[PDB]
């Protein structure tokens, strides 16, 4: 299914997929291609992004670290606590003008 000789070939495949918009790669397809895949995958560290599906299959994506941004989880939870899904877009704009922004 994939031709992945070694660690470097794994990284280049993930990279090319990112560059060419080819999408996610199932971990199991990599496991079939690459003996002792666990070594290579671990070695590459956070250069890979993992998504878990409901059936617990893992999908691999190249991690582009160009955009990297993160905040404390307290700020993540705080962000979530400000509801906008129930709001009219107009109402959001009214607020911004009310506050001078």
């Amino acid at each position: 299914k994939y031709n992945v000789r070694d660690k470097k070939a794994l990284l280049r495949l993930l990279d090319q997929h990112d560059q060419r918009g080819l999408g996610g790669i199932l971990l199991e397809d990599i496991e079939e291609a690459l003996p002792n895949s666990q070594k290579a995958v671990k070695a590459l560290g956070d250069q890979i992004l993992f998504v878990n599906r409901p059936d617990k299959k893992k999908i691999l994506f190249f991690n582009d670290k160009s955009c990297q941004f993160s905040v404390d989880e307290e700020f993540q939870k705080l962000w979530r606590s400000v509801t906008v899904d129930s709001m009219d877009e107009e109402k959001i704009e009214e607020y911004l003008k009310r506050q001078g922004i």
Partner: protein, 177 residues
């Protein structure tokens, strides 16, 4: 689409939403308008998993949806959902959320400093920690109510926020044209 708009959206999606959301949004940054089915095949997400991610991004007004309804080759009616990033609504929601977050933090800071740390067991007057020290009586060695003189009884996030959020403020300003 201006590079600074793209970067704002990429930063915000990574900071405040999951990996799944970031990867879905990447597709909508690569391409103006994309079919949910195409997104599904690209990401290899489960169907409900993707729909839930898209539902979340649509609720926070980051992305919008336009249906296309056509007659297919087999004659049946076809309903495609095309998604796209709506940058004017995205920027507004971001400002809206950051303004309320700041204000909630500010309110919490005001509450904590005005906290009624001390209370008179008689007249129920309460005092803040700042008020409390000028209640001390050197002649008895204890803190005493300013009104009835009864012995009183017991019972930064903003700086962090400002540090961590400045990249978004900067990208917001950059986009102001």
């Amino acid at each position: 689409v201006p590079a600074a708009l793209k970067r704002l959206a990429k930063y915000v999606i990574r900071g405040f939403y999951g990996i799944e959301h970031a990867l879905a949004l990447d597709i909508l940054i690569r391409n103006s308008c994309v079919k949910e089915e195409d997104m599904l095949e690209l990401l290899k997400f489960d169907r409900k998993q993707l729909r839930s991610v898209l539902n979340n991004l649509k609720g926070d007004k980051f992305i919008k949806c336009r249906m296309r309804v056509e007659t297919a080759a087999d004659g049946k009616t076809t309903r495609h959902n095309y998604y796209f990033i709506n940058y004017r609504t995205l920027v507004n929601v971001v400002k809206y959320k950051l303004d309320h977050m700041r204000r909630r933090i500010e309110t919490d800071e005001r509450d904590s400093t005005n906290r009624a740390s001390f209370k008179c067991p008689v007249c129920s007057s309460t005092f803040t920690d700042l008020e409390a020290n000028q209640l001390f009586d050197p002649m008895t060695g204890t803190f005493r109510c300013t009104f009835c003189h009864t012995e009183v009884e017991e019972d930064t996030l903003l700086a962090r926020f400002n540090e961590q959020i400045e990249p978004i403020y900067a990208l917001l300003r950059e986009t102001e044209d």
